Amino acid sequence: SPRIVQSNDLTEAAYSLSRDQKRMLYLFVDQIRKSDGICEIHVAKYAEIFGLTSAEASKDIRQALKSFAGKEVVFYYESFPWFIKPAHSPSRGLYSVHINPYLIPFFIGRFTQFRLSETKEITNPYAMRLYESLCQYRKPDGSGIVSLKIDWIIERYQLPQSYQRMPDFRRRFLQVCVNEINSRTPMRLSYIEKKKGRQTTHIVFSFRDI
DNA sequence: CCCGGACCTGTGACAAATTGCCCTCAGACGG
DNA sequence: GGCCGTCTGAGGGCAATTTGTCACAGGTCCG
Ligand SMILES: [Mg+2]
Ligand SMILES: [Mg+2]
Ligand SMILES: [Mg+2]
Ligand SMILES: [Mg+2]
Ligand SMILES: [Mg+2]
Ligand SMILES: [Mg+2]
Ligand SMILES: [Mg+2]
Numbered sequence: 001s002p003r004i005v006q007s008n009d010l011t012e013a014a015y016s017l018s019r020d021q022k023r024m025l026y027l028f029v030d031q032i033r034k035s036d037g038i039c040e041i042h043v044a045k046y047a048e049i050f051g052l053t054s055a056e057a058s059k060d061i062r063q064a065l066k067s068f069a070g071k072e073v074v075f076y077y078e079s080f081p082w083f084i085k086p087a088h089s090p091s092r093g094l095y096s097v098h099i100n101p102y103l104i105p106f107f108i109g110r111f112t113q114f115r116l117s118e119t120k121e122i123t124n125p126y127a128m129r130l131y132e133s134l135c136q137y138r139k140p141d142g143s144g145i146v147s148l149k150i151d152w153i154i155e156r157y158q159l160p161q162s163y164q165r166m167p168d169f170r171r172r173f174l175q176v177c178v179n180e181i182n183s184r185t186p187m188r189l190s191y192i193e194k195k196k197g198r199q200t201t202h203i204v205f206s207f208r209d210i
Numbered sequence: 211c212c213c214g215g216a217c218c219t220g221t222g223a224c225a226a227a228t229t230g231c232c233c234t235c236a237g238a239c240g241g
Numbered sequence: 242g243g244c245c246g247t248c249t250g251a252g253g254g255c256a257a258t259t260t261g262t263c264a265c266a267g268g269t270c271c272g
Binding site: 062093162 | 248249250251252259260261262263269270
């Protein structure tokens with residue numbers, strides 16, 4: 001199945017995207033890499049890739065597309081808009097989109113890679129972000145270990161404000177996304193908390209491949 | 211000493227958002 | 242050639258779950 005590769009600068013960028021938007025973004029990066037910024041998406045192909053009906057594919061594409069407007073991306077800093085023209089459909093079942101050509105070099109550069117089947121069943125977009133960050137440190141054989149700082153997790157994934165209270169961070173983000181990865185990818189993930197005084201400062205992740 | 215206070219933890223409630231489903235009906239095409 | 246039957250997909254919606262927010266119980270240490 002398709003092998004996504006991307007510059008680490010994207011793995012570590014600050015942005016806020018939905019699951020459906022992140023799914024489309026993987027195909028754009030794939031289209032661009034296999035070569036102005038003009039990409040295309042077919043309804044019926046999207047449906048087959050992610051096991052959706054044609055109707056629900058159409059709904060997902062259409063709503064993802066109008067929610068890109070005004071979204072912006074920050075590389076740590078420098079901010080860019082994803083799209084520089086609205087999306088549009090020349091033919092029935094077909095969409096044409098205009099990615100910011102100044103984004104091309106951030107996509108293709110020190111890189112991260114995974115096959116698309118590894119991520120296509122994940123539902124929570126923050127769990128997609130976490131699985132991408134871990135892949136960045138994976139070894140050939142399939143294992144790795146990394147310590148991520150909590151403030152940088154909050155900044156980069158643009159987590160919502162109530163997850164600055166640590167018990168809510170644990171309950172609604174960390175535990176849920178470690179559970180998804182363990183249930184929905186071929187990765188097996190564990191972690192431990194690093195402390196300084198009363199405050200928890202980092203999370204230490206270890207993982208292997210099944 | 212014990213206080214009120216500034217920190218930290220977890221859980222019960224409720225609000226807001228997202229999920230896969232379901233139904234309608236016109237577009238595109240070919241036999 | 243041209244209508245119609247079928248495969249699509251662009252709409253309109255739904256209830257069940259998940260995600261996002263905050264009050265209050267209950268621990269520690271400080272001055
Ligand atoms: Mg969302
Ligand atoms: Mg949907
Ligand atoms: Mg403290
Ligand atoms: Mg004594
Ligand atoms: Mg008392
Ligand atoms: Mg009690
Ligand atoms: Mg008390």
